[PDB]
Amino acid sequence: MRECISIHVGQAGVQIGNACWELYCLEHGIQPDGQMPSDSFNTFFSETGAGKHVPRAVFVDLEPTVIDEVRTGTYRQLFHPEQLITGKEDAANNYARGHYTIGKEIIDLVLDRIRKLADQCTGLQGFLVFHSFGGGTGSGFTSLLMERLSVDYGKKSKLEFSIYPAPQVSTAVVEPYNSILTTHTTLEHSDCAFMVDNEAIYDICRRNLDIERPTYTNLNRLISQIVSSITASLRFDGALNVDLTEFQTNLVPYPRIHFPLATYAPVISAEKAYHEQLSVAEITNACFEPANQMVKCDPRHGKYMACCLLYRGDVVPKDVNAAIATIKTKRSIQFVDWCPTGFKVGINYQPPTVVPGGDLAKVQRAVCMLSNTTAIAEAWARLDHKFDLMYAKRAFVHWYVGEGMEEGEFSEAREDMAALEKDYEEVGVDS
Amino acid sequence: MREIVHIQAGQCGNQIGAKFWEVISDEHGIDPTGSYHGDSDLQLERINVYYNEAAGNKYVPRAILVDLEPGTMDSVRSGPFGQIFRPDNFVFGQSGAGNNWAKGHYTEGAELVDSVLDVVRKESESCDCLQGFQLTHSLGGGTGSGMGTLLISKIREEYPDRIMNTFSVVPSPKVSDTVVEPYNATLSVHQLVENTDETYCIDNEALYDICFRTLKLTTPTYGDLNHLVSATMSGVTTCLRFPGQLNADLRKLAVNMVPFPRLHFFMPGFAPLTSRGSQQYRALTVPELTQQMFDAKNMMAACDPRHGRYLTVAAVFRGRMSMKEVDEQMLNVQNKNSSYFVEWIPNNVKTAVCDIPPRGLKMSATFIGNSTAIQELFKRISEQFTAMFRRKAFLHWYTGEGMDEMEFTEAESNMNDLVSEYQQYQDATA
Amino acid sequence: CHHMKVVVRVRPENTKEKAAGFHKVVHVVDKHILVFDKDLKFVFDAVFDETSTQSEVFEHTTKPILRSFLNGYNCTVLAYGATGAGKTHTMLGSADEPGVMYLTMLHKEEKICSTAVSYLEVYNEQIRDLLVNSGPLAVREDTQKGVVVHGLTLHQPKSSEEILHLLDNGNKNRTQHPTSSRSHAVFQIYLRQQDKQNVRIAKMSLIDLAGSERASTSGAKGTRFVEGTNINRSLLALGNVINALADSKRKNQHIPYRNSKLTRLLKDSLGGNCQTIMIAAVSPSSVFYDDTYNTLKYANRAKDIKSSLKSNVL
Ligand SMILES: CC(=O)O[C@H]1C(=O)[C@@]2(C)[C@H]([C@H](OC(=O)c3ccccc3)[C@]3(O)C[C@H](OC(=O)[C@H](O)[C@@H](NC(=O)c4ccccc4)c4ccccc4)C(C)=C1C3(C)C)[C@]1(OC(C)=O)CO[C@@H]1C[C@@H]2O
Ligand SMILES: Nc1nc2c(ncn2[C@@H]2O[C@H](COP(=O)(O)OP(=O)(O)OP(=O)(O)O)[C@@H](O)[C@H]2O)c(=O)[nH]1
Ligand SMILES: Nc1nc2c(ncn2[C@@H]2O[C@H](COP(=O)(O)OP(=O)(O)O)[C@@H](O)[C@H]2O)c(=O)[nH]1
Ligand SMILES: Nc1ncnc2c1ncn2[C@@H]1O[C@H](COP(=O)(O)OP(=O)(O)O)[C@@H](O)[C@H]1O
Ligand SMILES: [Mg+2]
Ligand SMILES: [Mg+2]
């Protein structure tokens, strides 16, 4: 049938993929060692020998710490040993190191493994790439990998699940350089790019789930829920199904505007579950609240261009239609002039599953939203201002220049980002 | 994988190295004899960064013992954890510098450098993927300063793409332990500015102040100061040995903390530090570690960060914590003290979290700050040098070993340029 | 007195690339206006093209500098261009003989003129003497004087062909493509004017810079890469110094000279104390495309306003 290949690069990507694959094994009844104790799950797993299921994933990193954690942990016998690829020295928060110097000794190995994985496939339709903007190996090796894949495959869709930098929260000083450079290089090689902000996930965990110490595990579990909601149409049957091609043909109006925002509803704790009669209209409404958005930006500052709603569980189509009509008649949320019909709705059957030890309740229905809006222009402006501030005095530039990057690449990336900003501003003018 | 070679030169370097190796061996559960008696697999998972596997379940530290006099390493060998070192790595002369930079750089060090480099090469080729070197020394002595700078230059020539770390005890601002420390300090900073990737500056007076005010130690000895320096070293290199939720190696810290090549002189710190009686009266939480880290009295260098502005800051947390708490603490520190951080760099603070805490404590942290307030140390040393140099006092001891006054003038001008750069980078001009 | 002249030498189209389906991204109008492609407007003093021969650039490169390089500290001619543009060709093929072997005969009635010359290269952030085989040399600074290369060799030719012999031996000892990533070659001329007065300090500096390489996109690893990126960092430091020497009205401040050995040698020659002129080479083909219009071209606008001084007739 139709299958998907998942690629996780860097520490953030590897940890997010670990959470996602624990969730996937839990959903289908697969034990941590791969065996099924009891067949629509082959879009992500493969039958090997006598009843063992191997995920169609490739784990890539330039340092051995986190991949070794995976190789020693409880899922050590789930993954193929050759699919967890490891280097020796990380990019050390340097785009040039990952793209030019350190990535070039394992890029061929990763491409060979990807080809070996996809050859076994018979209906391959897309890749899922997990990474972070602010990292060295993340940004650099992701740009190199997507360039190589676009050269090699071309027609297959290439989605992204990236960690956008936060407006205030940061864990590095050279984040704007890597973000701008990776955006400039990747802009012409990715079909779509769904993004979330760590600061917004912290806010959701603190406010909705009432957690005061949300470590990275809770964030990765929320992101796993989003990805599971996206791929449930592939793995399970439903009333309305959505493929990987429909996302790109519906959410992307122009080739340079492919940065949707991913939200989820309902994110609630088991204390308020017993007192709330969550229903289709309520979760649909909650998907539009600015406080519930998973990227630290206000949708009220821009105009919506295209929204995808993914329902799963005990959901009736008529209630979805009524809720969508109610959203449309609301005057507080705006749509662009040239998109009279801007909704894509998919209705599934399998309710979301609960991971034991998690911080979410058991709900009979849920919604995942992906929306394309011009409110990200402010985030682009903030990133460009940080780049301009740090670059006028040429701070940290020698680190990148000594690793094989010319000084002209910074100017090229900045001009490309300015052009993208102008495109975003021009697409939002009513006529 | 990523492995480190350790070099210590002179009396102070040797003593700090001995204390540091006892600390690290107790952290990884290795007896004085060199055998392993730990209770966790994570101790032996990354033992190769500091140790070599010998025959019969034995571990030999990758350390080089350099000195121009034999008594210090005689005491080191005869002491505890003295049988843990490989005897061939004890490289000593017989004459000694006599608190003379020229003697340690041009007369005796020029003779010992071949043997020390042979040992260093033998240790470095056996490495699988050399990450960098690490030198422990001072700036007020002859053998320490002179031979350390000579070795640093030779290693930079041999291995230019690696990482060079230095833990140098800069001269104290109030009381001087040697009459000729300004000359040696200037002539060694002249070489550290060029041949070192990152330098951690530590003052003995700040260590006394910490040991008397925070730890409430009635009679602190040099063992306590070496203990503090060892704790800082282990906290700096902790991410290479244990897994974490967000990890950063030496090169990542160098990239994130050094905006320009000539500005790589940091001031370290540690938290928590408390007295025995006050430990019952405090709670160990991320806000408390953050508050203690950004304390003037907690700095390990005799410089006040409130007189200048931070360029970059690195904090390496250890233990089990939540990244949200750490991140909001960093944001709060940045926003409260907006006048103490440079404008043309947003997000001045770098962060890393390690899962495995220090033995004992459940929480700990390490502070590395690249501040423009360190210019005061260089300015004071330059003032003392130029006061003692017009009269040419004690100069013949240095010019009788071939050194000429052009070298002194070059070193003084280079130090003045470094001071001018650090002062000038307090201006936003925007 | 202050205008750091910038001249652009548009190289002729390469023979192998001319017919291989490329257009021209550089259009020449005359010796005062140039146009890019988009459709950017550029003015860089004098402009040369393929029509001008090797000796035809003399009219606006060195001749109205070396009229008599005594009244001022004079020539500090640099040569940008990056790989393949032709800076090394333009400098070391012909347009250094107009300096000497073609401008050694200048009159004697008012003065007795003798010269002292020296040659050095900057390879891997080290200084070597190109005329005599000697190891790395040490640069020493002082308040009174400037930088002095401890161990450099001085020569005093008393004729004209002696300079051609010295120049010819100064290029076979250069690290010549182990053209590719190389060393920055510096030629220093000292002019002596003993009167038959003590107005004798003038020094003429000719520099042939190396090119900035992109390594992985176009280059190699190991050697040619460790010896590389030192060119890149030295060029970054030179660009920082140039930008800091012409910033608005603040100027002054602290200019980061000590970030490379190349900029230290130019401490007394890049600041404002002399009449200096720059030369840059650009390829009009579209295969390079981006590297032909960057700090190769954008930056030279910022170095057209390097205000200097020439009242010191010493
Ligand atoms: C009642 C009790 O258990 O006290 C503890 C202790 O943790 C306290 C009191 C310790 C104690 O430290 C001191 O009293 C001290 C005295 C002089 C100089 C430096 C320290 C302690 O020595 C510290 C020591 O901690 C360790 O062992 C750490 O792992 C430490 N290693 C060593 O101290 C060490 C010494 C010799 C040989 C091998 C290891 C370490 C610190 C940083 C990085 C790596 C390792 C322990 C448990 C204690 C005492 C004994 C009182 C403190 O120190 C540290 C470094 O944590 C004092 O401030 C903290 C507060 C702690 O609560
Ligand atoms: N949501 C989420 N974000 C993460 C996680 N791990 C790391 N990050 C993000 O990643 C950023 C740090 O850079 P990394 O992605 O770790 O860079 P890297 O992949 O390790 O590559 P290097 O720079 O070479 O170390 C932080 O700002 C975090 O926001 C994670 O588990 N979940
Ligand atoms: N004899 C000798 N004395 C030194 C040397 N290096 C430093 N000193 C002096 O020793 C003083 C402190 O060194 P030390 O006490 O050993 O350092 P600490 O114990 O780690 O704090 C400094 O002020 C120096 O003047 C050296 O190599 N040899
Ligand atoms: N005016 C010109 N006419 C023909 N060829 C030229 C001209 N200028 C430069 N070239 C060619 O361009 C190449 C540039 O090489 P060179 O100048 O030696 O080093 P670099 O490429 O580092 O500047 C030379 O091989 C030369 O043949
Ligand atoms: Mg990493
Ligand atoms: Mg050339």
Numbering used by the authors:
A (entry chain L): 1 to 38, 47 to 439
B (entry chain K): 1 to 430
C (entry chain A): 9 to 45, 70 to 139, 148 to 218, 224 to 241, 247 to 364
Paper text:
The dynamics of kinetochore-attached microtubules are regulated by hepatoma-upregulated protein (HURP) and the mitotic kinesin-8 Kif18A, but the underlying mechanism remains elusive. Hepatoma-upregulated protein (HURP) is a spindle assembly factor that localizes to the chromatin-proximal region of K-fibers in a process mediated by Ran-GTP signaling. Through its stabilizing and bundling activities, HURP regulates K-fiber dynamics and spindle morphology, contributing to chromosomal movements and alignment. K-fibers also recruit Kif18A, a member of the kinesin-8 family that walks towards and accumulates at the plus-ends of K-microtubules.
To directly determine whether HURP and Kif18A exclude each other on microtubules, we determined the structure of microtubules co-decorated with HURP1-285 and Kif18A1-373. To increase the likelihood of these proteins occupying the same or adjacent tubulins, we decorated taxol-stabilized microtubules with equimolar and near-saturating concentrations of HURP and Kif18A. To dissect the different populations that could be contributing to the reconstruction, we proceeded with alignment-free 3D classification, which detected three distinct classes. The first class contained density for tubulin and HURP (~40% of the particles, 3.0 Å), the second class featured tubulin and Kif18A (~39% of the particles, 3.1 Å), while the third class showed tubulin density only (~21% of the particles, 3.5 Å). For the Kif18A-containing class, we were able to build a model and visualize kinesin-tubulin interactions. Further classification of the Kif18A-containing particles with a mask around the inter-protofilament groove did not show a reliable class where Kif18A displaced HURP’s α-helix but the groove-binding loop was still engaged. This result further confirms an antagonistic binding mode, where the presence of the motor domain of Kif18A is incompatible with HURP’s MTBD1 engaging the microtubule, since the motor displaced both the α-helix and the groove-binding loop of HURP from tubulin. We concluded that HURP and the motor domain of Kif18A cannot occupy the same tubulin dimer on the microtubule lattice due to steric exclusion. Our microtubule-bound structure of Kif18A provides insight into the nucleotide-dependent conformation and depolymerizing activity of Kif18A. Our structure of the Kif18A motor bound to AMP-PNP has a docked neck linker and the nucleotide-binding pocket adopts a semi-closed conformation, which more closely resembles that of Kip3 ADP-AlFx than that of Kip3 AMP-PNP. A sequence alignment of loop 2 shows that key residues interacting with α-tubulin in C. Albicans Kip3 have diverged in the human homolog, highlighting how sequence divergence in this region could be driving differences in the mechanism and function of kinesin-8 motors across species.
